[PDB]
Swiss-Prot record, chain A:
One of the sliding clamp subunits that acts as a moving platform for DNA processing. Responsible for tethering the catalytic subunit of DNA polymerase to DNA during high-speed replication. Heterotrimer stimulates the Holliday junction resolvase Hjc. DNA polymerase I, DNA ligase and the flap endonuclease may be constitutively associated with the PCNA heterotrimer forming a scanning complex able to couple DNA synthesis and Okazaki fragment maturation. Belongs to the PCNA family. The keyword Nuclease does not apply. GO terms for molecular function: DNA binding; DNA polymerase processivity factor activity. Forms heterodimers with PCNA2, which then recruit PCNA3; does not form homotrimers. The heterodimers interact with RfcS homotetramers. Heterotrimer which circularizes head-to-tail (head is at N-terminus, tail is at C-terminus) to form a toroid; DNA passes through its center. Replication factor C (RFC) is required to load the toroid on the DNA. Heterotrimer interacts, probably via this subunit, with flap endonuclease 1 (fen), Hjc, Dpo4, and XPF. One of its GO terms (biological process) is regulation of DNA replication. Keywords: DNA replication, DNA-binding. NCBIfam families: PRK01115.1-1 (NF002218). HAMAP family: DNApol_clamp_arch (MF_00317). This is DNA polymerase sliding clamp 1. It comes from the Archaea.
UniProtKB/Swiss-Prot annotation, chain B:
It catalyses: DNA(n) + a 2'-deoxyribonucleoside 5'-triphosphate = DNA(n+1) + diphosphate. This is DNA polymerase IV. The record marks 12 as: Substrate discrimination. GO terms for biological process: DNA-templated DNA replication; error-prone translesion synthesis. Its cofactor is Mg(2+). The keyword Nuclease does not apply. Monomer. Interacts with the PCNA heterotrimer via PCNA1. Mg(2+) binds at residues 7, 105. Binds 2 magnesium ions per subunit. PANTHER family: DNA POLYMERASE KAPPA, DNA REPAIR POLYMERASE UMUC / TRANSFERASE FAMILY MEMBER. It comes from Saccharolobus solfataricus (strain ATCC 35092 / DSM 1617 / JCM 11322 / P2) (Sulfolobus solfataricus). Gene3D superfamilies: 3.30.70.270, 3.40.1170.60, 5' to 3' exonuclease, C-terminal subdomain, DNA polymerase, Y-family, little finger domain. The catalytic core consists of fingers, palm and thumb subdomains, but the fingers and thumb subdomains are much smaller than in high-fidelity polymerases; residues from five sequence motifs of the Y-family cluster around an active site cleft that can accommodate DNA and nucleotide substrates with relaxed geometric constraints, with consequently higher rates of misincorporation and low processivity.
Curated annotation (Swiss-Prot), chain C:
The keyword DNA-binding applies. InterPro entries: DNA_clamp_sf (IPR046938), Pr_cel_nuc_antig (IPR000730), Pr_cel_nuc_antig_C (IPR022649), Pr_cel_nuc_antig_CS (IPR022659), Pr_cel_nuc_antig_N (IPR022648). Gene3D superfamilies: 3.70.10.10. One of the sliding clamp subunits that acts as a moving platform for DNA processing. Responsible for tethering the catalytic subunit of DNA polymerase to DNA during high-speed replication. Heterotrimer stimulates the Holliday junction resolvase Hjc. DNA polymerase I, DNA ligase and the flap endonuclease may be constitutively associated with the PCNA heterotrimer forming a scanning complex able to couple DNA synthesis and Okazaki fragment maturation. GO terms for biological process: leading strand elongation; regulation of DNA replication. It comes from Saccharolobus solfataricus (strain ATCC 35092 / DSM 1617 / JCM 11322 / P2). Forms homodimers with PCNA1, which then recruit PCNA3; does not form homotrimers. The heterodimers interact with RfcS homotetramers. Heterotrimer which circularizes head-to-tail (head is at N-terminus, tail is at C-terminus) to form a toroid; DNA passes through its center. Replication factor C (RFC) is required to load the toroid on the DNA. This subunit interacts with DNA polymerase I (dpo1). The heterotrimer also interacts with flap endonuclease 1, DNA ligase and XPF via the other subunits. This is DNA polymerase sliding clamp 2. Belongs to the PCNA family. The lineage of its organism: Archaea, Thermoproteota, Thermoprotei, Sulfolobales, Sulfolobaceae. It comes from the Archaea. One of its GO terms (molecular function) is DNA polymerase processivity factor activity. Keywords: DNA replication, DNA-binding.
Amino acid sequence: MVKIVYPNAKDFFSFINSITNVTDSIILNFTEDGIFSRHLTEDKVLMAIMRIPKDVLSEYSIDSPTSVKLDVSSVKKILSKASSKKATIELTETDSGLKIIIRDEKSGAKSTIYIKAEKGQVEQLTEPKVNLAVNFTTDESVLNVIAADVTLVGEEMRISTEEDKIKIEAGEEGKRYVAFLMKDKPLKELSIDTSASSSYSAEMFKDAVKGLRGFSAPTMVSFGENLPMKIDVEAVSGGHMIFWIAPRL
Amino acid sequence: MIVLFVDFDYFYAQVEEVLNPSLKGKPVVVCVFSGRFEDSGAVATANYEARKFGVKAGIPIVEAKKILPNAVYLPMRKEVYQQVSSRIMNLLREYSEKIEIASIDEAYLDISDKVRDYREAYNLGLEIKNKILEKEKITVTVGISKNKVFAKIAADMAKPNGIKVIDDEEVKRLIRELDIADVPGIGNITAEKLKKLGINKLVDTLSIEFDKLKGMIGEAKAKYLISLARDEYNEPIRTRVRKSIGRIVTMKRNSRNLEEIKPYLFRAIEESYYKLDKRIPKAIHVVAVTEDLDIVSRGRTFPHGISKETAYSESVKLLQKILEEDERKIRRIGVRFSKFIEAIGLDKFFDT
Amino acid sequence: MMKAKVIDAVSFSYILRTVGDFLSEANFIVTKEGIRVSGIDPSRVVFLDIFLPSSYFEGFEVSQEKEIIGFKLEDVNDILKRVLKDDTLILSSNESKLTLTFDGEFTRSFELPLIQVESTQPLEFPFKAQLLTITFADIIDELSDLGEVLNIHSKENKLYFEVIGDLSTAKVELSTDNGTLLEASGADVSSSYGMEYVANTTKMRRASDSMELYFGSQIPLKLRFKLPQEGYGDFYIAPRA
């Protein structure tokens, strides 16, 4: 028996939808520390991770650590109920899968979905174990500009440090794009430990950026010399959505 | 096949000892100083004197310094290690051409065509060790076996300044007797599940369902471990990474007939994609050799990849262009691919 | 080498979208006077001729008495769609590339290698009218989906637009006497034009407050969209056979 109460239904839907940028089917893992989901694309270049520490849930109870697989149709059922209204979500296990109750906070009713879902056995959360030399903070609007620009111009993007700015480049034969980001134009924060550059799939970058939707918090991007890029946003109600993108070598 | 693997011993730190021989026999710790603060970074490499005390690659410099406060800490001087390594790789090329340079301190030689048997391979390994000591003052460990993985295990078992052969009889023994975590490529992340799956040995993977191996798991790792345990893993030594890949084929007769040329061009394509494998090319050129032995080619670039289907349809268009632009008969037809997109999985950053 | 900051990037982008309905590629002809773009469409029905005078820009600089910059309309127009709310647009070139830079909340440039575009060249009209460009655009936007042919006639210094399509019809009277024409004079003259070509130019309302319409029998329709300063976008549209 797994029983969870999320204080912010809006964020719950944002997490589910964000993971969907990488898979059609979602596995939720219920552990002693909270909830997580971890999915990679078939080529393993892009990973989505949702981490929700139990200390940000209103209520959290498991017997044994357990996974629940939501197939394509179950993901669609859940997202068909997505709403911006202030609400609570109660998630409980049933014999055949899950029950999800959404409780409107301001008057005031509640609605239910029943999800048929395979159970069981938590697989460990494995991320790149990597030291990332460059970090910067920005928001989804800026990253969406970048993603649309790169994707218009090339299949691959390169990000590097140049003095006290971030440089983003993309191009195909003559036809190129270059942007410079710095502290306060437009970056909220910028930490360059050591100089670094890496190249990434522009499509995978764009997919990660789509996965920031619905979250208001600032987004942190980290990268290193020929290392994976990490993109991390903390939900208002707690917990993180993280994407990792493998470099082109 | 006979693979001779060379692993340079504690390389970065050994180079610092060559440069300053008054360091030899004391702990030497080469570090990558990052990062935001005093002593931010990680040990790159430690000599064996330092390793004794548990100072080793990847530990933070601060933790190394607590353990060995009086050891010699040096910043990484990559240019110097790289110059030394390039020279040694160049020496090794003189033993076999025929060499896969796997990293700055690791090379695999296929010497199947150089020696008769393992006893000759062993003596060739001693000459190589003597050569590298004479030219660069660097000690290395040599591992000799039937494939790259067992050559590397042999060097793991012999380092530092060692040389070891693992012959056919010992290969059979180690499949049974060797901890699976000690198999090259299998990090603690894959191997530490199988420890709790009742798979403690390479052989233990022959008693698990092939599908059950993909797994915990993953298909490519499954076909790897299974063909090792099956003693069917070979090789081969990958020499330099090509910038273009393709195939040209001779036709039975000179022709300008698209319908007669097409089957030859399609088979070139077929042979080519097999070699590209995971590489997605952005450019394709069709190459024709004319009856009078001139070369005529035409190509096109596609910013996103070229799939085999795209290559089929685009190659016909480029052949049509050749035929429109040159009056001559062609005798050979071929295709080359270039400008590769090569994705590496987030894999290669988990291990270990 | 040249450089020009565009004072109205939106007007600039609508001009180039209009050009692009007719031309696949063109040359910016750049002199100290400003920037000219001319060409004939593939069907040879339409000749256009745009002049943006140096005053249309800020910090207009030139290294050369004449610099010819070949470009693909679609590539430039794709890039111009990337402009943000607070961006300044700066056009620049050297021997090898045209660059479009957006300077705003941060800086972003797009470069295009120059391409070789063959240069291009090709009279008075019995009737001439002047009107607001918004008035023309409103009237045409309405008529353009009713048929493939715009019929234009004048009678006693009144102008008439008529369309008879497969299903529906329209007739608009434009004259000084009503709200719609500024000045008009000439002979009673009638001609017809391909509606799609004329409909394409209604985008010029985003760069132009007033215009000149000229036509006569079995002669071109000239539309001069007057731009700020001495600037214009001329479109000449051949009469139907």
